[PDB]
Every structure is written in structure tokens, then in C-alpha cells.
Ligand binder design. Structure first.
Ligand code: NA
Ligand code: NA
Ligand code: NA
Ligand code: NA
Ligand code: NA
Ligand code: NA
Ligand code: NA
Ligand code: NA
Ligand code: NA
Ligand code: NA
Ligand code: NA
Ligand code: NA
Ligand code: NA
Ligand code: NA
Lengths: 294, 294, 293, 293
């Protein structure tokens, strides 16, 4: 449980101008999260450009993140794939790496059934001893892992939680009532995450935490302590970021914000991500200023 | 133009019981399409389980399909990827293969902007002499290539057409009016394909054509000749298949139907596709019987 | 024949007090007679059916009939979300001179397919007037499906449908369930030409309020299979087709009517409010695109 | 305080002719008094507002007030899609004894945020009675957004909202724009407990028609922060929360009322039709799950 709760950053993969991982920038981010009280780092999720790294660069970024973390902050590896054999293969690369767990997205594009999702995640879970956090994000995947199937999978010993990114807050108690008390419920939607914690959620895997780590850590700890009015004060400060970090496709805005705050050298991404527009720059700058970060 | 019109089959990748390509079954399918008057074969699209073949098996199936075709029927290679560098790499593998063109899906999962889609397809187009057919399917990808961006891309010399799979028939004339007369408009939605041709579409890339090739060839030729009442007679025969081939995730139903008609040895798929349910079997059998195929 | 081509969903022109302005309605009806409009729908959605009581509703229909003076057929809006009120409103127009009724699926109370069947069947049985069913789920919360249209088409004086989903798959789904003389009309200007090209017989049009000559020409060209020529007209009308909804209908089309000199006042009843500055600029650019300004 | 907890959207019980059945309404109101229901909404959606004319509407509200006899507060449904009709209906209840009005966003005519503002502001200015705004886009075609709720909350007798989207992000979006005594009520039974846990003050409930004791207990436990205990009740009510909509509301809840002996007849007005065999079996299994049968 506890390690997989609070503010978990869906960390950018900072790049040089050629699109290659920038170690010095990642080191700065990881020292930042250690200092800020971030609970854990998700390495090569969606915000980390999993889509545009091959499995070798993917593995390199995860092992680099672990190495820079140096035991100071838990690392969760993104291990999602839309082929079950590939998800198992990617998961096996990190067995005994030192990561504490895996974040495994529902297959994207091929739109499996609820039985396909069950057989997919069960097969992955049987090929590792690592804790598995299911990841539901239908806007990106074209499929919806429903609470009934979550309940089914929760019975598998090392399936320990879900990163629910629908923004549909009815999912919190629909899942909670089909699962044991130590099954972890994490928001994957920054704008609705405090609401998600107020309904019983245990934390959030956050893009906003990339640039407001100390605020996001404080908001999740206040939510866990049941101080929701104090948590809402931080959430109101952060809400323009929660929204405007998606004004253009994630992670285009958050990489620009990281660069503007001096957290990374370069806001470079890989195609088909393209540089932030003038209009997006002014929108994200107004949001950083609203959060008191600029 | 003409080669990229009429009934184009989105061909299954027939597998043995281990999930490996079955050459004897693919040979039977390809001789079937030659005999039936199918215009062309799309090799390793969505129906061909692109999602669960690695790029090496992908390349093998395409080269196998070309080899079995033996010049008798044009082959279009599925070349889609959600990373631009990977789309270019996959496209380069088929340069000078003998395929006549590429079917290239909008990046899935990473949800690029209209400018990201432009820069993605333009970069691919600049790395080949092969004709490129854009593929829009938001239900699977999480993004929507809009007519405005299609018009932009149509100006690139070897971007020659789109496989519009929204089922939104307003797209036909929205695209047609932004593009030249020889820009190819193909339905990617069997249930709405005749409607799509009646509005100006030039053909369809079809799952139904896998099991009703001669009917689908005849329906597209009648539509092209402007005999829509005669085309609707075939479409009414086929409509339960057009729908029920999606009763469970494609290609689970069409692989079962292919096996039941004796067109392939095995209906085996790769996870996260799972075997057809009892209920799906009886639904697809009733649909085959309605089309007069059983 | 009378239920095909360009049918205007005519505005109820108002004075500044929100009362029907006969002189403006006379000018609109003369304009439709001169432009080749096939028929007038009186007090549909575009006619502010929502904000007229049944007495003002009946008066506007009787005024429209009187002004038409046999020169152009009049179809009455007769919709209601209570079946007893639909019958009662329908019974007011029996022997009025209207050629038919446009009857929307009940809004707000979200009936079943069986409730829609019983609703339209009851209405049809209380009149000899032809009935055109009207599907517009975006306004009603309710979707009359092709299967239920097929069921209703068997009732003698249920003669057609205004299909306002903008879902063009409904044309051949309905057409294959109904007789060859069941009339298919678009209720969606932006997709109407597409609708006719798939086999629709006409449109009940907001755009035809201000581009009646172009809308009559486009529907006639489509009916004769001159689609290339019909697409040229649709391209010059497409900004109106879209921007007449840039604010709630009929706020833009009433402003356009006034701007072209077709009506004295762009006045509406609450909860419709005056067109915004941004709206005026959008609608003026669309009128200019159509060659009307 | 009076606008919090479990508020029943009460059925208008009918005889077989479709007329209000006073003896059945008396038994429902005695039942709500005995069960701890906080208040009655009279002639809302569940009360078939759509199929009663304004005279029958007023009679049902006056009958409900009379039967309540000061034992339980009565809130009148006063919604209309024409602002002049909303004012007129509201003016009928001034000095009636109702404690407040529930006024739905105009349905069918799809006004702007500015039109909704002018609609509710005009209504509020023609009464001293508290106004509860009612957002239900699935029925209306119209979505009253938090920003517009904030604007309206500044008008003295606009005191709260029934938020029936089932979108739980609206609770804190509205709450941060309005004063601490602006009342937030769920209009969606299946998500009501969630709504209260995010800071909502109560629910206007279909389920409370047949599980009034459980619904009062769940809202009171939620208000006191006994969520574990409130979730146990929600779990035994969840099949009713969902299956009372298995057919159009109020077809299932009227059948459930009759089956429990709370009303004489499950009769409705067209276009509502009798519950299907499949519906009866679904609703009976849900009543049994709730321990009511
Ligand atoms: Na990144
Ligand atoms: Na971002
Ligand atoms: Na396949
Ligand atoms: Na299939
Ligand atoms: Na009007
Ligand atoms: Na006309
Ligand atoms: Na309705
Ligand atoms: Na249409
Ligand atoms: Na308008
Ligand atoms: Na009722
Ligand atoms: Na109660
Ligand atoms: Na509305
Ligand atoms: Na709710
Ligand atoms: Na009900």
C-alpha cells in the first residue's frame, strides 16, 4: 500500500535537441522530487513519451531513473503494450531491476473485450513478482476497463491497484466495493484528482506534479488527513495548470513549463509531438503564474 | 487512382494453433481474392493483427502476401506507427518490395495535434516514392484527422488518398471539396461503405470482403456504375455481417467465419484477442446464413 | 410531390413587444412564393413554437395560411410532449387548409420506442391530415429509431419524417423499412444535400429563410441528379448552414432576415436573447459568402 | 436546513382514467412524513409535469400542500421553456404555502448561458419564494454550466441547484463559485451518495418514492460523515437507483409503488406506457435486493 499513495509524478523524459534522453536534466528533476516529497516516480508512462521510445531506450530511461533515484524515491516502470507477449517481455526486462512496481495500460488500438483485458493482465501478472497497477484511459486507448473486470483482476495476488484516468468519479466507489481494502485507487486525471481522493482515492499519478511537486505532495497529504478545505486551497491555485497542461497534447505544455522553470535544459519532444504554439506558451505561463511558480 | 478503388480486403493474418502465420491458409485466401475480383489486399492492417505482430513478423507477412499474390492482385502494406521515426523505418522496409502503396494510420494513444498529424504524414511521405493512403479511425486511435488537415496533406505528391473509418458520412464531401479529383476516398466502415460510395467514395477497405469477396467486389462495381438500387440488394444481404463481424473485437468474428467457410485452417489469434464466445459463434453463423454463404 | 424540395422552417417575425408582425410575415411569404420554396412549415422550432401559447400558435398558422392565399402549401407544427395535447393542437387545424402536420417526438419526458409508437399512432387516428414525424434528439432527449419509423409508416396518414440527427446512415436504414412514397426530409441544413444524394426527397430548412432561391435551386438540382451544380450552391451556403446556429436558432436567422430587409425587427421571446456582436459579424460574413450582402 | 437530506420527487398517483388519485397521494405523503423524508417536490419530472396542463399541475401542488398539512415542506415544480410561462406558473404558487420552487433549464429551445441567466433572473424577480435551479441536459438539450450558476447565485432568492448531470466534478466547480449557504442537491440517485461525499447537502430522489426510510438514513449518515454506514445502504439501494430507469421514469417507480401497496394504480399518461414484463421482473428483483419485498 503506502509506497503507492500520495503524489506520484508521471515524469517527463527530458531530451536534448536531438530527442535523446538528457541525464543532467533528469537528475535535476529527480533531486527536485526527492526534495519536494513526491511519493514515487512513474518512469516512461504517457507523460514520459513511452509512445516514441523503442523498448531499448524505454529500458534505458527506467534504469537511468532508478540509478539517479539511488534508493531515495521509489520508481514505478511503465510496462504497457497492446500485445500480451510484448507486455510480458517488457515486464521481464525490469524483474530484479529495483523498481517497486509496474504501471500497465489496457491495450490501445486493438480494442480487446473485458475477457481479453482479464487474460492480458492475468498473463502479465503470472510472469513477474512485481506489483502491478492497472491503467484505464479510454480517451487514449479506445477501450474501457470496467469496475467488474477490475474486481476480477484484483483477486490476482500481484495486481494491487488501478490508475483510473476516465475523469468519471463514479468509478471510485464502483471499484472500491468490488475490491479489498488494500487495493490502491489512484487518479490519472489531475483536474479531478482531489475529488477522486475525497471519494476514497489514495493518491494521483500526476502531470501537474512535474512542475508543482511540493504543492501536489501537500495536497495529497492533506486529502489523506481529511483536510479537504485546506487541500482545495492548493487545488484552486493549481486548477489552471491541471487544465492548461493539456491545452496542447501532453507532454508538450509540461516540457515547456519544466524548461521555463529551469527544471530541464530543453523542451524538445519526438514527432508526432511538435513544439508548443505561441498561444499555448502564453496559456501555460498564465497558469504557472496563477500557481505562484513564476 | 484505379488500382486503389473498389473492394479492397483488409485481409486476416491466418495463424496456426501457436499463433504463427499459416502460409497454406494465406495462399487459399489470396487465390480466393484473385478469383472473386477483389481490387487489392491490405496486408497487416487492423484486421491483420498489426497490433500483435512485431515489425519483423509484420514485414514477413507483407513479403509472404506479395510472394503468394505473384503479381495477380495489388498489395498495400499497413505501415502505421504512433512514432514518426518508426513509421519511416517500417515504410523503408517495403520501398522496392513490389507493394503498390502504404496504409498509414494516425498515431494512436499519444493523441497528436492537427499540426503533429501534418508533420507525421509529411515526414513519412518524404522518405518513400510509394503512394500513401491516410487512415482515420478515432474509435481506435483517440485522435481525429479532420478534413482541413486532409486537404493540407493531399498537396504532398505521394499522399494520394484516405481510408475514412469514422462512419461519419459528412466527411466524404468535406474532404472531396478540399482535394483534387484523383484523391482517393475509401470507406473503412463496412456498414456505411455503400452510403460512402453513393456520396462520392471510390471504394472500401473491408473486413466483410474477407468472407464475401465476390459480393463486395460486385457491390463496389455497381456503386461505381451508379446502380445503387442493385448495389443495395447486395448490401441488405451483407448488412448483418457488416455489423456482426464487430459483435466481438475484430478480427475474432471474421477469423471464425473464415474457418467455418473452410477459407483458413484455424481461427487462432494472439492475446489480447481471445476465442469467439458461444453467443458470438451463433450470431456470426446467422449472419453468414443471411448472406447465403452457409 | 408537395412534401419535397426546399421547405422553409419559417421564422415568426415579431414587433418589439414580441407579438407576430403580419406585414413582415406577408413579405416573407411573398418572398417564398417568388423564390420557388416548395412549402412553409409554420411554428416549428425556427418559428419559436416553444414561446407561443397554443392560441398564439394557432393564430400564426391561420395567419400564414391566409397570407399564402393558396399560392404555397402550409404545414403546421403540431408537436407536444403530452399525447392528449398533440391530439388537441392537431384537431385545431382539421379543415384549416394546411396540407399536413409536422409532429416532433415528445421532448423532456424521454418516452420508449413503444411510447413514441403509441403517441404518433393516437395523433394519426384523430386527423385525416398527413403526418410528418420529426426526430431531433439534440433538442428532445429522445431518438426515434428506423425500426419504429417502419412501424409507424404502416399507419395510413403517417407519410414521412424530418430526420434532424445529421446522421446520414438513417436515410437508407429508414428507406429500406418503408414504402417508395414515404417522404424522407433532412432537418439538418449542413448535411441536407448529402441526405438528398443518399435518396432524401427534400429539406425543412433554416437557411431557406434568407437564401430561398439558392435552397430551391439546390434541392431541384439534387432531385434531377445535377449534384456537381448542387455542390457549388451548397459550398456558397455552407457558412450560413453552420453559422445560423452560431447562437441558438432562431437568433441568427432573425438577425439575418432583418439585415436583408425581409422583416422589420429581429425581436424574439425569452429565453432567446439578442444576437451578440460576435454573432452579427459571423452571420454577416456568411450572408456575404452566399452573395446576399 | 429545509432544502437538505432526502427530498422525494413524488409520483402523481393516478386512477385508471389518468386523473390524480387523492387517497393514494394521501398514503404517499403519510409514508414520507413517517419515514423522515425532508421535503416533497410536487410535479417535477417524476410527477409527470410533462402530461399535466397548468391547471392540473396547480391542483396537484395545492392537493399535496393540503395533504401535507404543515407536516412536511412542499417544493413546487415550476419549470417552463418560455420565460413568460415560468413567471405565470410561479405566480400561481405565491402565498400558497410551498416553501420554494424547482425550475428546470428550458428544454427543446436550447438557450445560451446568457438566455438561462435572463430566464432564471426574470423568474426570481417575480416571486419572493426560494428558487432551486435544475440542470438535466439528458432531458433538456441544454447544460447550465457552473460559471452561469455562480452568476445566478448572486440573485437573492436563487438559493440552490439540483444537479442531475451525474457529472460529480460539478459539485466543487459550483461550490467554489457560490456562498456557503447555496444548497447543492443531487438529481441523480445512482451518484447521490458520491455527490454528498464531495460536499452536496442532499438529493431530490426517485428512489425515495419506495425506499424513503433508507434514503433518509443514507443522507443523514452522509451529512454526519458516517460514510461507511451510508455506503452499506447505497449498496442495497443501487439496483433501484439504476433499474428505476430500466424504462422511462416514472414507469418503473409507479409500478414499484403499486407493488408495495403505496398507490392503488400504476397508471400513467401517454406517452408513458405500461411497464414491460421484463421491466416488472427487473424492478421486483431490485425491490427484493433493497429488503422491501
Ligand atoms: Na516526456
Ligand atoms: Na503537458
Ligand atoms: Na488477423
Ligand atoms: Na471480425
Ligand atoms: Na421565429
Ligand atoms: Na426555398
Ligand atoms: Na424526450
Ligand atoms: Na441531413
Ligand atoms: Na438561426
Ligand atoms: Na408521476
Ligand atoms: Na426519504
Ligand atoms: Na434546451
Ligand atoms: Na449526483
Ligand atoms: Na421510475
Amino acid at each position: 500500500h503506502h509506497m503507492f499513495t500520495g503524489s506520484i509524478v508521471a515524469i517527463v523524459t527530458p531530451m536534448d535537441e536531438k530527442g535523446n534522453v538528457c541525464r543532467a536534466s533528469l537528475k535535476k528533476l529527480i533531486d527536485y522530487h526527492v526534495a519536494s516529497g513526491t511519493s514515487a516516480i512513474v518512469s516512461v508512462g504517457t507523460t514520459g513519451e513511452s509512445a516514441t521510445l523503442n523498448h531499448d531506450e524505454h529500458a534505458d530511461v527506467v534504469m537511468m531513473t532508478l540509478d539517479l533515484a539511488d534508493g531515495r524515491i521509489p520508481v514505478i516502470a511503465g510496462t504497457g503494450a497492446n500485445a500480451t507477449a510484448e507486455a510480458i517481455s517488457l515486464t521481464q526486462r525490469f524483474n530484479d531491476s529495483g523498481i517497486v512496481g509496474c504501471l500497465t495500460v489496457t491495450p490501445y488500438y486493438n480494442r480487446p473485450s473485458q475477457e481479453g483485458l482479464y487474460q492480458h493482465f492475468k498473463a502479465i501478472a503470472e510472469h513477474t513478482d512485481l506489483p502491478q497497477i492497472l491503467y484505464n484511459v479510454p480517451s487514449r486507448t479506445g477501450c474501457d476497463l470496467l469496475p467488474e473486470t477490475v474486481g476480477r483482476l484484483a483477486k490476482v495476488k500481484n495486481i494491487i491497484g488501478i490508475k483510473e484516468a476516465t475523469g468519471n468519479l463514479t468509478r471510485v466507489n464502483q471499484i472500491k466495493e468490488l475490491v479489498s481494502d488494500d487495493f490502491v485507487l489512484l487518479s490519472g486525471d489531475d483536474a479531478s484528482a482531489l475529488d477522486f481522493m475525497q471519494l476514497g482515492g489514495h493518491g494521483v499519478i500526476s502531470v501537474t506534479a512535474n512542475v508543482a511537486a511540493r504543492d501536489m505532495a501537500q495536497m495529497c497529504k492533506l486529502a489523506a488527513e481529511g483536510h479537504f478545505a485546506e487541500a482545495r486551497v492548493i487545488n484552486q491555485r493549481l486548477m489552471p495548470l491541471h487544465n492548461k497542461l493539456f491545452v496542447e497534447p501532453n507532454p508538450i505544455p509540461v516540457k515547456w513549463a519544466c524548461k521555463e522553470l529551469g527544471l530541464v535544459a530543453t523542451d524538445t519532444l519526438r514527432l508526432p509531438m511538435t513544439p508548443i504554439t505561441d498561444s499555448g506558451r502564453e496559456t501555460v505561463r498564465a497558469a504557472l503564474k496563477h500557481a505562484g511558480l513564476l
